Design a protein around this nucleic acid. Structure first.
Lengths: 83, 106, 93, 97, 94, 104, 81, 97
DNA sequence: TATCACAATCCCGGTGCCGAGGCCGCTCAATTGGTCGTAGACAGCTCTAGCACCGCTTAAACGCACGTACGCGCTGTCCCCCGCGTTTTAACCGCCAAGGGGATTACTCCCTAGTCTCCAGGCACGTGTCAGATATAGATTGTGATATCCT
DNA sequence: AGGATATCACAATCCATATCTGACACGTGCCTGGAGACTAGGGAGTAATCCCCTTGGCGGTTAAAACGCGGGGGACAGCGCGTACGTGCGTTTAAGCGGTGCTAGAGCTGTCTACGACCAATTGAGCGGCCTCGGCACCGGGATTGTGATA
């Protein structure tokens, strides 16, 4: 079994810049990158925990697309395109 | 044997929607008109979204409706954007929009 | 091989009658199918709660009419009501 | 040689990314991040190749939606730069924590 | 003559057991009764949807336990699952 | 005879809760462990909120829990204020909170 | 009939509402603006309330009708029914 | 004679109203406003004496919740005064319109 | 403030390829017809219960004068963020072998619905006591103006 | 000659106490619904296969990221200043209370009736799977607004 560590630093600076440009931001400060990594980690924990609850309820090991879609729907973030 | 969809003048399935109601645990018994009515509204909303999406795809000289066109046609409609309020669309991008205070002044 | 039970071909029919010369991708078909599913679940849930508040047990067309008048915003809920009433009326004939 | 003034490559990037609809995070680092996060809830899990895709779509939509509001909050204060104060204010107004 | 059922006496029992020397006003009891109705409907609706995604037809204790884990956050859900398990065990011991 | 809510050491009515689940159109068949589990969590939530409310009412020199004390004891706790996301409590007031920039 | 009642939400009432919210100093153009906001919120709630009523063939807007109208906008109200 | 400096009666009002839990709008003007609004949806209606109370509680909770976020947005811009720009920004971030 | 050279952007178009459309066979589910129990539409009635008005207070709102501090506008600094160039590091694509898990099907045994009964637990109703609210009053406090001690 | 600053005065908040009313805790009557006990049953646990699809590995390409430099521009600090908002006072006015009458609507009861579930059989509609092609991506290349350097 593998154990992965320090992966939040995998979301690099240019990726966050790309996200911001899509959002419409013109100038980005220098301390936004760590803050964005933090926000991303928090959202991801909140969604993956519900997805894993839905999975291990049905006696499974394979987090399905629909488990994630339900984990999102139960946060008011309906996601059309994977059901 | 005629399909109820044909009798009611629709395209969406009245039989399948009625069954889906009966086995979804919505009430103990389900009236005949509820299936027809629900199917009519479903088909109307589908017609609205698909019409606007086809328009938005023709405004790009593209003869095929892709997710991007559905997003463009839903965010550019007040009522539909109110209906898709909390909804994300995969592969949908965002609307081209730049705030005024960011453009070069001169 | 279990069957998959979607709204693909009905959405395709509606599209081919409202925009006869344009097609639809597969991703867009999935999105429209999920959209129909979500609106169905919203409207049916609201009709169920309306039947439950008034101590009823049947989901008649009155409850679906009210659930549509609740969920759909503004001007949509007028045309959807018109279409539904026209369909039911032509059914009873 | 040539040198664009600061604030034109930025706007060209804005116009390019607001138009195309690809994925903006590299798929493999994001997938590894998802697995490293899930390690804390059930050891030795297994992810469909489409569950990761759904998680990435949701995550990018969330971050884009957050940056739009951060940009509004930054313009509110006579600026164009976005700082962590703006992100925290937006996440407080929207009701998150 | 019409009647209506509420959680008044039960909330009052719980209070008199956790805070033996403290009353509860009328409006506060109405608030706690609304609270119980709301949490009940949340857990039960989520459990229904859960037993409907897996094509089951029975809301066993499993569905309620998972719905409690989904709704109540953090340290609340842990203790609530513990209390539910203790209760079910005591009852099943007849 | 013997009550069911008292057969499991509970205080919330397992009979009424089971009948509500059944006659509420949630699923078709409903187990006998669902009522007891649901009643256990309902009683736990009531006990926790009522305990924090009684504490907040005692730390205000009173003896009767009023809506003010339930609002105080709900907003002043992390998990509970997370469970009360969009709940307005009638006659609840708000949390006493002046910002730091407004101070002199 | 009733005309121009949004002026019944007087300026001191808005001062008190802002003081409960934690505002130290209020501009002069807030008041009118605030009324607008209020006159929209009610329109979104009362309508639903009325919709929940004329569906039960009734004519009196109960308190449960208002509670349900709120709940269906994620603004649950504890304390009434 | 005596004269409190601007910004102490304000804070005393803040501390007084954040503590008590009455109703802040006069019941009769609000009830008349509710009836005048409902006139546009069904003529010759009828309101329970408690439905108006629930509507008033919900409305005051909403306005207080909005003023908290407006105050945050005003402090964000180096101010203490709240202007309509702040209300509009808060109502845009929270997702209303 | 008008003009020039270069660095994306856009459109023409030609190829291919691949994802959409058409078509076939089956198979599962929608339709039809009785039969019945079932809830729901309907008339009357009794009774709340919300509406209307009015008299009277009196607490709250409004309007004005003032004067203080806060928003705003201008200028200047310098820090920090963007643009650009190089290098390389890690993503992408794919080919694939193991294998581990998810779906399916048939059995079966356990756990739940249905029904009648009956008792005991819960709700409406009175009843009186206790605690919250109100009124004064005193003592504690926090705020603001001022003479005095420094530069 | 003004600022600092400890220092003096005054309105507001807060304990402490009586007293007072109403709102809750408690006992009672009655009812309705929950608990047993039996029967039928159908849904979930168990086992066995099996096939498919996810992990792990590797190997090659290549383009996206990291770093480092350099220049500019924008965020922050600092000050003046004009206005507009808070504070307070005095007059006025509707909001609250309570009280009474009125009628309109609402819940309930019996009554019927039409309608939707249940079941057994039939066929046609739709879905999975296989072919065929036309829209889109992709690349090369010519034409076009645009942007900073020139004057």
């Amino acid at each position: 079994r593998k154990v992965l560590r320090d992966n939040i630093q995998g979301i690099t600076k240019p990726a966050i810049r790309r996200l911001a440009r899509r959002g419409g931001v013109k100038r980005i400060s220098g301390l936004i990158y760590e803050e964005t990594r933090g926000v991303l980690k928090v959202f991801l924990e909140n969604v993956i925990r519900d997805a894993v609850t839905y999975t291990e309820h049905a006696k499974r090991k394979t987090v399905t697309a629909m488990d994630v879609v339900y984990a999102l729907k139960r946060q008011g973030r309906t996601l059309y395109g994977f059901g | 044997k005629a399909s109820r969809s044909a009798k009611a003048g629709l395209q969406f399935p009245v039989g399948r929607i009625h069954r889906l109601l009966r086995k979804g645990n919505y009430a103990v018994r389900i009236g005949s008109g509820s299936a027809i009515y629900l199917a009519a509204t479903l088909e109307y909303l589908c017609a609205e979204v698909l019409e606007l999406a086809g328009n938005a795809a023709r405004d790009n000289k593209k003869l095929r409706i892709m997710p991007r066109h559905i997003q463009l046609a839903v965010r550019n409609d007040d009522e539909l954007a109110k209906l898709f309020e909390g909804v994300t669309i995969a592969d949908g991008g965002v609307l081209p929009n730049i705030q005024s205070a960011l453009l070069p002044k001169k | 091989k279990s069957r998959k039970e979607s709204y693909a071909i009905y959405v395709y029919k509606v599209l081919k009658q409202v925009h006869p010369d344009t097609g639809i991708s597969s991703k867009a078909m999935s999105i429209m199918n999920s959209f129909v599913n979500d609106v169905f679940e919203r409207i049916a849930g609201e009709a169920s709660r309306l039947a439950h508040y008034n101590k009823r047990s049947t989901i008649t067309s009155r409850e679906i009419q009210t659930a549509v008048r609740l969920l759909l915003p503004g001007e949509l809920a007028k045309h959807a009501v018109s279409e539904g009433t026209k369909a039911v009326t032509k059914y009873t004939s | 040689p040539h040198r664009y003034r600061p604030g034109t490559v930025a706007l060209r990037e804005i116009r390019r990314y607001q138009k195309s609809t690809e994925l903006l995070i590299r798929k493999l680092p994001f997938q590894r991040l998802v697995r490293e996060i899930a390690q804390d809830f059930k050891t030795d899990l297994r992810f469909q190749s489409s569950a990761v895709m759904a998680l990435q779509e949701a995550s990018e939509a969330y971050l884009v939606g957050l940056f739009e509001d951060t940009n509004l909050c930054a313009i509110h204060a006579k600026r164009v730069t976005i700082m962590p104060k703006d992100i925290q204010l937006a996440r407080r107004i929207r009701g998150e924590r």
